[PDB]
Amino acid sequence: EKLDKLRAEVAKLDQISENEKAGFISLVSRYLSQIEWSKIQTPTDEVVVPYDTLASDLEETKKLLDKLVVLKLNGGLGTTMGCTGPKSVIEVRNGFTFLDLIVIQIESLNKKYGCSVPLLLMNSFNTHDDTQKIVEKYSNSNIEIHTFNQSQYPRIVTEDFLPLPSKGKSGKDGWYPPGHGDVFPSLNNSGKLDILLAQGKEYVFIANSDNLGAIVDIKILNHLINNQNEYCMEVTPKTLADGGTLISYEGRVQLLEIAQVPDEHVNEFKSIEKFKIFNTNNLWVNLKAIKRLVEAEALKMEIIPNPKEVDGVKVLQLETAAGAAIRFFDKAIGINVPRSRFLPVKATSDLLLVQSDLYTLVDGFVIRNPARANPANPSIELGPEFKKVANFLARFKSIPSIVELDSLKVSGDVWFGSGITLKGKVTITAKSGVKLEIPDGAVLENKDVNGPEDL
């Protein structure tokens, strides 16, 4: 029994709590111990509710908001985009970080309705101390901000299936936060869940701190209160560029990810024709239901292995997803929302969009320029030279105007001046060894640039 050998070594660790050891051992048990395609059903409009059908007063809206807590997933670092510290503290636009804008937006909500919707940041051991220091700057803000630290699990050395860390030794490299599905046991273990319940809060709105579209939506909250759904996942129509989908399966809604799709149906799953929606990671969950299901040990989400290398040594990081929890909640639904609620910043190409003239900031909210009639955003592709935020900023003296852009692709050592306008289809391909400069004031429209001769 490899399970006993691992549980015994986990028990000797002194860096994490007994609750965390038990949760990790549980994940390992499921990992060590596929959907039936013919049973999958497309959700009806009663199971995935189109946003246009939602039922449309300051004081009554306060009564709704008084039941809400806003939780932002803040356990991840800015590594992908070349930044240290929490991903949420990268600057988005006009010097404001993701977390800055979240705070201003809740301040706006509190002012308009005379409420105090609490903000709860779910940190990880990778972000918690920095976030504690950072949230000192909101001390004078019209907001109640709290934080908690999610679970800390040991990485598993793949070769011998033993924990990487050891008793009484430091080192972040030995550990990992076990995904966003951990929000539910962590809300409980940290004590925040009992406090929220005791305060009369009833629903938590969960979202990634890097989704600029994930604002509190009164119509959605109103629907949940009126119909007592225990869980609502916001989905949005699939495009070619898109993720897990909601299905009806054995009489209730559940998330389906490609990992659970048998090989012979992966192409049908990946197609655009059968599944029309995907999960935005905007989640609304009933707090009493979480407590019930955490205490019943019912939240047995699919294990996501997420393997990694620590100084070239292969490790396992067993994780779970927050969206996968939906199949355990009663009266669970999807809501199919417009894509304006799905604006994740995952790459510097997304920063280009939000920092451009395509958007502006209005009281903390990211507002799309109405002069772009096309509701689709331009496609933007940049080479690895632009991967890191600082390098992306250096290579754009100003952000080009892209209101009329269809698509931009840039590769090679390219440096943009200021005051540039891009229209239609623009490709810029700097050949090997060429440091290509796009001049100040350039207008590029339906143009392929392959060298200085094209400028």
Numbering used by the authors: 13 to 45, 50 to 72, 76 to 261, 264 to 476
Question: What do the study's own words say?
Answer:
The crystals have the symmetry of the triclinic space group P1 and diffracted to 2.0 Å resolution. The crystals of ScUGPase-1 contain two molecules per asymmetric unit, labelled monomers A and B, eight sulfate ions from the crystallization buffer, three molecules of ethylene glycol from the cryoprotectant solution and 353 water molecules. Similar to other UGPases, each monomer of ScUGPase-1 contains three domains: an N-terminal domain, a catalytic domain and a C-terminal domain. The catalytic domain consists of a mixed nine-stranded β-sheet (β1-β6, β9, β10 and β13) as a core, surrounded by six α-helices (α3-α9), and resembles a Rossmann fold. The C-terminal domain consists of 10 β-strands (β14-β23) and two α-helices (α11-α12), with the motif RFKS419IPSI, essential for the phosphorylation and binding with 14-3-3 protein, between α12 and β17. Hence, the uridinyl group is likely stabilized by Gly94, Gln169 and Gly198, whereas the glucose portion would be coordinated by Asn227, Gly265, Glu278, Asn300 and Leu92, though no electron density was observed for Gly265 in the structure of ScUGPase-1. A slight difference observed in the active site of ScUGPase-1 is the orientation of the side chain of His199. In the AtUGPase structure, the side chain is orientated closer to the β-phosphate, whereas in the ScUGPase-1 structure it is orientated closer to the α-phosphate. Analysis of ScUGPase-1 revealed a buried surface area of 480 Å2 between monomers A and B, and a complexation significance score (CSS) of 0, indicating the corresponding dimer is unlikely to be stable.
UGPase is an enzyme ubiquitously distributed in all types of organisms and catalyses the formation of UDP-glucose, the key precursor of the sucrose biosynthesis and cell wall metabolism in plants. Among the various enzymes, UDP-glucose pyrophosphorylase (UGPase; EC 2.7.7.9) is important and essential in this carbon regulation, whereas the sugar, UDP-glucose, represents an important branch point in the C channel directing for synthesis of starch, sucrose or cellulose. Recently, the UGPase from sugarcane (ScUGPase-1) was characterized, showing that the enzymatic activity and regulatory mechanism are similar to those reported for other UGPases.
